[model samples]
Each structure stands twice: as structure tokens, then as C-alpha cells.
Target chain A: SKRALVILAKGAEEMETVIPVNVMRRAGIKVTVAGLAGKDPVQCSRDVVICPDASLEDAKKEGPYDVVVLPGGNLGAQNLSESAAVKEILKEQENRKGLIAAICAGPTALLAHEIGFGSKVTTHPLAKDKMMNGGHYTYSENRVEKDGLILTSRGPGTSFEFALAIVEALNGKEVAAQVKAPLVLK
Target chain B: SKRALVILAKGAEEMETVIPVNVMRRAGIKVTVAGLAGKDPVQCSRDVVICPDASLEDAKKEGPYDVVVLPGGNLGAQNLSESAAVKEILKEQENRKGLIAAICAGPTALLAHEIGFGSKVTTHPLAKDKMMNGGHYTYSENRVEKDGLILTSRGPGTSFEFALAIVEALNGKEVAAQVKAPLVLK
Candidate 1:
């Protein structure tokens, strides 16, 4: 039950998705990698194919997970946000039965749901206008922002920290420290 | 049983491991994310605590996988290689029951096992000499390398490619193509 689901698309930013999945897995979350139906194993936006653990339809039946994390790339967000199945999952965030987190352009997908509107949020600085249009913007110099059950972060490089924040939010700080300590993270 | 067991320890490169796991999952290979006993949730090199599906002891009994993947980072490889339990499972590779793949510093752990000696291998550029001490070396710009059942690649950036290569090697070129087509992968 202590699990997270990361949605995959043809053009997913490998870094954003990979960093969070690995970080969360190390943190002790069962991360399920799922893709849309008919997706290919090597389908990715950048360098290569990204395999999926299950298809989107399969995941939807099995996963109403504790956390649903999304990653960002140029078209990854656009592709994910447009998925009707994903939108159904996002709409359920209000019950708190699930948590929604996105990074970089990924937050745009959340904005399309209008859950963060007028709520404090942040995203890739270049997408400031988009973030503003998507929600109430409270820009942070910090790499991540957490408001309610919605967690958002900056770019690809910030993924580890972004995931770390989510771990703390879901599991607690002690678990976060246990994992962070080995990295000598101050 | 098209599956693999990824042993998680503290400081594992979250992105490097998770990207491939995600990609492999998308390709329909089951990845059992397990952690060491007494080490509840494992943390990433960047300080995230990833939740695990099972403990290492449980996974070991469950696996005689088609491949064994070791994702790399500064100390992750060292942590895994030093584990008595991990060393035992890796030994199964000698029987050719599975493939052994590592990225960046991960091959160093394989080298400690003496698996790559005389086998052509690749790793991070800086690891050229260290890896050469173990095998025939080729500096390939290609994202992933396959020499027999041993596969290797560079950094976290190449995780998708690395994952795709694994799919192709274990499943077939057609499976790889199915995953590659949507991404416009070459």
C-alpha cells in the first residue's frame, strides 16, 4: 500500500521520471512504472526506450496509489495532461486518498486540472507565465514547493530533492533522514 | 519470469536505477524492487527514501532472473558489491541463467567479482582504466553495450537507452522496436 505510480509517455524526460522513481524506490516506496496502452518499450522523448511495469489501463485498475508522480519534458507533460485516464486520477486529489506531484513542465498537467489555481505553487522559471496561467504562483528560490497534497519542483536536476521532499511529506522526516544520511546530505 | 531483482541499498543512484526499472517495466519485464534486511526504505544518493516491495532475502529465493541489473553511483556500487548476499546472487551469472548489467561505476563491482575479465566492456570515461583492468575495453559513444550477457552504459542520462538495450537483448529486436517506434528512436 505504500506505493507510488509514475505515468510514462513516449517522450518522457528521462531524467525527471528516472530520478524520482529511483529516489523514491530507495526511500522504500514501491514505484510502479506504467504507460499508455500501445506504448513501446523503448519509447522515450530523449535518448532511448523507457520500459513500463504495466500499461495505463492495468495500473488504473490496480493503482489508486498513495502518490501519483509525474515528470516533465517538452512534450511529456502535454501528452500526459491530455490523457483522459490521467485526468480522472488527478480529479480525485481533492479527497486526499491520493497525492499529486509534478516537476518542471509536469506541473502544467496539474494546472490543466485547475487544482492549484490561486494556491501557492512553483515550476520551471521559464514557464512562469504558464505556471501563472495554470495556478496562483508563489515563486520560490528554493527547488521545491509543497502546498496541500500537491508537490511541485523546478527542473530535471532538482528531481532527487523533489522526490526527497515527497518522501518526507508522505512517509515523514525520519525516513527521509535515514535515506539522506548515507548521501551525507546536510 | 521475464524479470530481474534490483537490490537497493543506501546511496543508490535513484535516477540511474529507477529509469531502467521504469523502462523495463514499460517493456513488460517485472522488476522486483527489494531492499536489505533491517534497512526498511532505502535512500537514494540524493537523499530520497524509496519504498521497497520486498526484502532482499525474499527476492533472492524468488529470482533466477533473465538478467541482473546494477545501477551505479558514487557509493552505490560499493554498497552492493560489499554485501555478502549480493555477491552470492551475482555468482549465478556464471551459469548463464541471467545477464549482468551495470552502468558507470557499477561495472567496478562486477570487476570485483572477476566477471568482465577478457570480455569487452564499457563504463564512464574516467573508469576506462579501472574497467580495462577487468576486460577488453571499447570507448563507445553508443548508449548501451552488449557483450554476451553483460550489458553496460554510461550515466543516468542514458538510462532509457540502457533500458531499451536490455529489452532488445533479452526479449528480441521486435520488442525493442515496439518500444522504440513511438519515440522516434534510432
Candidate 2:
């Protein structure tokens, strides 16, 4: 089974996270929406509430995943970085050389986690200062960015592009093209 | 408590239907996935199996729903058009002024039901010929199209646009804009 784990932290950008999950899923991926273990549903920056299928800690114990995706919003950078559960996953990812992806402010989390330090990356313009610190920055008018296993993109507007890239990266470019053709995306 | 119902027949694109159901629910819309009675789990052309929450017959009984959505695949049009339950829902939608949506080949069902008779419609490039019987047809670069209470889009790849269009129509454009904004869609 092809599986992807999307980290649902409090204050995640609803669209950034949701678009990729839907897109990847449509591409025939099994997506596990793992949320921070808590009493209330993890709310997005826009007040959208997401009830996760599994807790972050529980997901960690469940062993490896094919991909780890982070969706961005204002608070995503700080929240995923500070969560020990998230940190452990990123560190474990380092050992496995697994794919690590983030979008918009989501990439900032990688910076905070020190995961992409000294690597080239891209993100929303608002995050330029933070994203450029230990990494090479590129001006990407393109909706999605794939630098090694680190995938990044703009904001909610780019969600479809971002999600399509995930589909291409994980599933293969041919399938992604087939899916994108009808949607009119090149 | 906004409620949306998705109609699934034997060849409904599972990803297109399920992705919308997942995203809309995540956006706080109450989404119901309905299939034919005794349909078991509907399978996609790509081989994903999705068990509907209830039968389409049961959905008709429970719904005077705010919106009825149709997702398309290769044979989805034939399966959905031939269903007695789907025909009944279309009749009620006509009478009650509720929102009705179809994507790709799914529009073939709506056109067969006579909903496309006087409406402006769009669908997959290959299937547009079928939608040309008395309907104003336009090829769109857009993901979704709305003509009065009828919404039509291209295909499963357009699911995000289709889903977001429903959210916008039902919830208001501003809400849709905010949702679209983070994804970088203006």
C-alpha cells in the first residue's frame, strides 16, 4: 500500500494541507492525516477543524511512512518545529533518507527543525528571510518546488500545483500528467 | 450545518468523489457519500474501492440536501445515467431549486436527465459532443462552471476546483477566496 503521512498541527493552513491530501489521494495514494494528540480537533488558521486519524506520537510508533508532508500557515513553522513528535519523525527521516516536503510557511518548519540547513529550498515570499539562512534560495514562479526530497511551494493558490507535484514525485510523472491534462495544467 | 451529497455508481472515480468529500468535510461541510443499494464498495477505474456511507436510495430518503455532486470517470456517465435513484434525485433538484453538479462524464447523466437542455455546460473534451444537445457549450480553462443551480466541470483532475466551487457557491465567494488565497489562487 502506498501511504503518505500529513502532519496536522494546530493552525495549519487549511488549503495547503487539504489540497495535497486530496490530490495525492486522487492519484491513488493512501494518506494518513495524523494530528497532534489532543482533546479538541486541531483547528486551522482560518478556524477549520481537522480531526486526525492518528496521533503524532502514535504515528511515530507505527514505523516508517513513504512520505512526510507538512502544510503551511502562519503558525505551521513554529508548531511543527517545537513538537517533539515532529522532530523525532524528521530525525528518523534523516536516517532513512526518506522524502520530506512542506509548502508555503510549511518549509519554514524544516528550517526551524534544522532539517534543510545547507540545502537549496524555496517558499512563500514572506518566508524568504528565514528560508535563506542556511539554504540556497531560488525565485520560483513555478507553483511547486522539488529540491531533492524536500518539496515546497507558494500558498493555498498553489495547492493544486503543489499536490500535483507530490503525485508526480511519489507516483510518477506520467500518471500526474494524465491527471493534470483534464485539469488543463501543464 | 451545510450538507452535501455525492452520488456514486459502479464506475464512479473514487478519488474525485472521495477527495471532495474529505476536503469539504475538513472545511466543515457535512458530506454524505451515497451509492446504489447493495452496491457494496464502488471501485475506481484505477482500482480504489470506496464503500459508500449509504445507498443512493437511502440518500434520497434522507436528503432534501443542499447540494448533490457527481464525480466522473470513464464509465461513470453510463452507470450514473442508468440509475433509477439518480434520476429521482435530479427530478427533486429541478423541483426544489437545489444545487446540482456534475464533472466530466458525470455530466452525461445530468444531460440525459434533461438538466442540460437549456443550460450552459462544459465537460471533458471527448465528452463535450454529448453535452451539445440544446445546451450552450463552452470549452473552459476553468476548473468548474456554474449556470444557475447547475455546476459542471471537466473530470476527476478537476475535483479540487469542483469541490471549491461548491464551497464558494454555497458558503459565499469571500469564504472561497480565503480558502483559495492560501493555496495561492487569487
Candidate 3:
């Protein structure tokens, strides 16, 4: 089974984080929602608290994941941007040519870490300015954008598509379709 | 501001639960995610753990909510169906003609609680048999089905539509539209 690491931090969008993790698990992927803030439950941007599978510090020991997922809320992305550990994770994933998926403000962390320079990316419209500040990457208005190993998507509304794209990337179209069918997606 | 009470049980679909809570919060609805299994973190169907705002036992003390939400995972629905506390809440909501929303298998719990009979409803296609066993209610193919004070939706994929419908029911279409626009929904 493919393995995925979803980084969870304070103020992360609970919908964005939960959607990907739930959908990927539906695709039979082994997903680890690693708390960047430690083993304690992290309060999301909407005040929903999530207890991650493990702390990022401990999860890194089980590294080389098929994908590294970043769910976005403004403060969450900022936290991801400031984490040296996240920098190492993204850089390593990029170096290994593995998929690194982000949504909404999450791609801004990719910009902060300098992991996907020159790739086509998308973010929540409110976050576009920050993502394009240095003009490090091309932007797309697409709901979900995949530029090589980097997969980007818009806001909470686009989470299902974003998750399915990652599933398709790792588990192939058949698995993605099977998983999508039960979700009742249009 | 309108307030909503979302019942969270072990094995609940985390996506369904989180999406509605987050989106309703965006719509300025005060949302309380009350755990049926007490205040400890509840492990969702896909094994994602979420910390609820309070226990159902405690949340009811502050009730008379504008809307009550039920998120569906098979096991979670079963748990809701078996809870006497859930039955009392549904009965009181129905008595007051307040909005009662259920998604996926969640409608089955309404049936179990003997609420919403003669109203149009919808459930995850996979769960239709369970919901229609007694032929007590009519079912719809619409993604989001709102028949009077009872609203029902298909599955995880239809969660956004369901949440928006709840927002429209409690607040107004304008607020729902404003909330939807920022979410970048298709």
C-alpha cells in the first residue's frame, strides 16, 4: 500500500485535513496524520481539534512517504513555513521526486520552503498574493493542479478533488474511480 | 447568531462531520460538536481522531439549537441509532419543528429514532435499504434534500451542498452564498 504523511499544525483547516486523510484511506492508502505541534491534539482554524497519529518528530523516522500532504489555513501554513522540519521534509520529498500535495494556503508553505519553484500552482484566491509574492511559480485557476511531483489545489471546496488527484497519482485511476464512486461526487 | 449542534460518535465520517462544522462556522453559526462517546477524542471511521467541544450529556443542557446535524459513517449511524440521548434530542427538535439535518447513513438514525416520518429524505445509496426498510419516508435522488425541517444528503461528496443548505435554512441564502464563494465551490 502507498503511504502518505499529512502534516497537522495549529489552525490547520480541519475540513481540508480530514477530507484528504479520509479519501486516501478509502483508496487503501496508509495515511499518517502527523502533528507538527507534537502528540497533543491540535486546534484547527475552525476550532475543531484533531489528534494526529503521531508527532512529526516521530513520524519522520518512518519517512520516504509516497506523498507529503499539507492542508491549509492561513496560520497553519505560516506554521508550516516556519518549521525547519517541514522544510527538510519537503526538500527531501522533492529530491526523491515524490508527490508533495498542498491545498489552499498550504502551497504558500511550499513557496516558503522553496520546494516547488517554477511549477504551476493554485491556492485560495485570498492566498494568491502571498503564493506569488516572489513570482517563484506560475499560477493556475484550476481547482486542482499537478505539476510533476507537486500537486496543488484551492480551498475547502476543492478538497475532494485534491484528495482524488493524490489517490490517482499513487494508486492509479481504477482505485481513484472506485473510491470516488462511493463518495457521491458530481 | 444561529447555533447548531452536531452529534459526533465513534466511527463517524470525519469528512462529513468536519466539513459541516467548518462551513457552518464560516457562515457565522455557532457550532457545537458534541461527542456521543463523552468528551474524549472520538476516532472516526477512517481512524482520524477528533476532540469534540463537549459530551452530548453536557451539550443538551445548552440546547434548543436552530439546527442539529448528524454526520454519517455506517458505524457512527448505528451508534446514533442506539443512543437514547440521540432519540430524545431528535424528538425534541421535531417537536419544536427545528431543522434536523442528516447525511449519508445518518438518515437511518432518524428512522431509528422514529423522527421525520412522511418527510422526503436522502441517504448514501449504499444505505438506502436500511433507511427505507419500513417505507416510512420518501427518498430523493437530489444531492441535498430538504423536506420541511428535515434535510438529508447523500454522502461525503455531497457534504458541502448539505452544509450550505443548512446555512440557508438557519441564516439565509445570501449568507450561504457568501460562505460558498470563499470556499471556491464548483
Candidate 4:
């Protein structure tokens, strides 16, 4: 079975966080929602409170997830970028050639951690300037951009597509399709 | 300012719950996420846990909200449908001609509570049989359907549309358009 790790932090976009977690579960992926601080409730960007399944420290012990997922919000992305734990995790995932997916402002965390500098990526339009400050990576406006193991997406509206992309990468198109139909996507 | 009340119960679809709450907040609406059981964490359908702002009993005291939202999951809808408290809430909202919005299997709760009968509605296709049992309402396949104060949506994929409809109803087209644009919608 495919396993995914979703890092949940204070000020994370609750919709971006929950949509992927929920869609991944529907795809039969084992998803661990790890809180950045500890195994405590996280107050997201919009003030929605979510209880994490485990602390990032504890979740790291399980290790080498098929995909490591990042959800986005301005503060949430900042927190993720500032974490030594997150930096190390991304580096290790890159070294192992595992999938690392980020959305909205999330790809900026990758830039901060210096995990996938040369890949093409997309982020929320408003975050484009912050993401391109040093011209580290090629930028694309596609709602979802996949370059080998590094997958990226734009904003909250693209969350489903971002999630399905992750599902397809870990499981396959068939499983992703199966999961998508029930959602009644337009 | 407009206000919204979202009832959280065991087995509620977390995405269905969080998406609307977050979107409405982004649209500048005051939203109360109230736990059906009590003021505590509620485990959603996919096992994601969320902390409610208040207990349903306590929240009702603040009533005659601009909108009352119901998120969908088989068990969540059942819990919502079975509650005498829920029955009273829906009845009062309908009697007052306040907006009552439900999505996916959530519309089934309206069927159970005997609210919004004969209004055009749509639900998760899988829930059609249950919702149509008594031919209580006209059914439509539209992703989002709104008939005056009664709003219904298909499933998770249509949540944004469902939510924006609520935003427009309370805040007007300009506000909804502003919120929708930043979401980077399709």
C-alpha cells in the first residue's frame, strides 16, 4: 500500500490540508497527518482547528513515505521553511528519489530547504514573487506541475487536481480515476 | 455581517465541513463550527479530527443565523437526521425562511427532517434513492442547485460552488466574485 505524510502546521490552509488528506484516504493511501509542533490540535490559516495524527518528530520515525505532502498558507509555508526537521526530511526524500508534493505557497518551502532547485514548479499567483526572488527554479502557471518526483500545484481551487496528481503518482491513473468520480468533479 | 453555523457530528465529511467554513471565513462571514455531541474534537468520516468552536446546544442560543450548513457522509447525515435538536434547528430555519444548505448525503438529512420539500435539490448520486423515497423534492443533476433559501450540492468537488453560492446569497455577487478569484478557480 502507498503511504503519504502530510505536514500540518499552525496557519496551514485547512482546505488545502484536509482535501489532500481526505482524497488520499479515499484512494486507499495510508496518510499520516503530522503536526509540525507536536501531536496537538493545529489552528489553520482560516482558524479551523485540526488534530494531527502524530507529531512530525514521531512521524519521521516511520520514515521514507511514498510521498511527502505539503499544504499551503502564507504563515504555514513560512513555518515549514523555517523548520530544520522539514528541511532534513525534504533533503532525505530527494536523496531517496521519493515523491515530494507541494501546493500554493508550499513550493517555497522546497526553495527554502534547497531540495528541488532546478525543477519547474507553480505556486499561488500572489506567492510567485516570493518564490522567484532568486530565480532558483523555472516557473510554470499550470495548476499542477509534475517534474519527475517533485509535484506542485497552484491554489486552493486546484487542490483536488493537486491531490489526484499525488494519488496517480503513488497508486496509478486507475485508482485516481476511481477516487475522482465519487467527488463529482466538473 | 452575515453569520453561518456548521454542525459537526461524528462521521462528518471533513472536507465538506472545512471547505465551507474556510471559504465563508475568507468571504468575511462569521462562521460557527459547532459540535453535535459537545464542545470537543469530532472524528470525521476519513478519520481526520476537528475541534468545534462550541457545542450545538450552546450555539443554538446565538441563533437565526444567515445560513445553516450540513456537510455530508453516510453516518454524519444519519446523526444529523436522527437528532431531535437538528429537527428543531432545520424546522426553525425553514420557518424563518433562512438559507439551509446541504451537500452530498447532507441533503438526505433534509429529507429526514422533513424540510425543504418540493424545492429542487441535488445530492450525491449514491444518495438519490434515500432522498427520493417519498418524492419529497424535485431532483436535479446540477453540481450545485439553489432554490430560494434551500441550497443543495452534489458532492465534494462541488463544495466550492456550493460555498460561493452561500457567500453570494449573504454578501452579494461582488464579494463572492472577489473570494472566488483569489482561490484560483477553474
Tell me the TM-score of each prediction against the true structure: 0.56, 0.66, 0.99, 0.99
lDDT of 4 at B140: 97
- Model 1 ranges with Cα > 4 A deviation: A1-186, B37-39, B134-141, B181-186
lDDT of 4 by residue, B1-186 (tens): 899999999999998999999999999999999999999899999999999999999899998799999999999999999999999999999999899999999999999999988899999999999999988999999999999999999899999999999999999999999999989899
> Model 4, residue B176: displacement in angstroms?
0.4
What is the per-residue lDDT of model 3 for residues B42-71, given as tens digits with 9 covering 90 to 100?
Answer: 999999999999999999999889999999
Deviation in Å, model 4, residue B132 alpha carbon: 0.6
Against the true structure, candidate 3 reaches a TM-score of 0.99
* Candidate ranking (DockQ, best to worst): 4, 3, 2, 1
> TM-score of candidate 1's chain B against its reference?
0.88
On DockQ, the stronger of 3 and 4 is 4
Best by DockQ: 4
Error of 4 at B22 (Å): 0.6
> Which lDDT tens digits does candidate 2 get at residues A1-186?
567888988888766666677667768888877886553467666544555667777777776887899988778667987888788888788679888888888887787776856556667777777777644454455567777877778775576777888888888999888767665442
The residue pairs that clash in candidate 2, if any, are A155-B182, A155-B183, A155-B184, A156-B182, A156-B183, A156-B184, A157-B183, A157-B184, A157-B185, A158-B183
Off by over 4 Å in 3: none
The weakest ten consecutive residues by lDDT in model 2 chain B span: B42-51
lDDT of 2 by residue, B1-186 (tens): 789888877676655675567556646777777876453666655443455678777777887888898888768778888887788888888789999988888888887776646667778777877777554554454567888888988865576778788888888777766655444553
CAPRI grade, predicted model 4: high
Off by over 4 Å in 4: none
- How well is each residue in A99-159 modelled by candidate 3, as lDDT tens digits? 9999999999999999889999999999999999989999999999999999999999899
Better of 1 and 4 by lDDT: 4
RMSD of every prediction: 11.2, 5.9, 0.7, 0.6
In candidate 2, how many Å is residue A10 off? 11
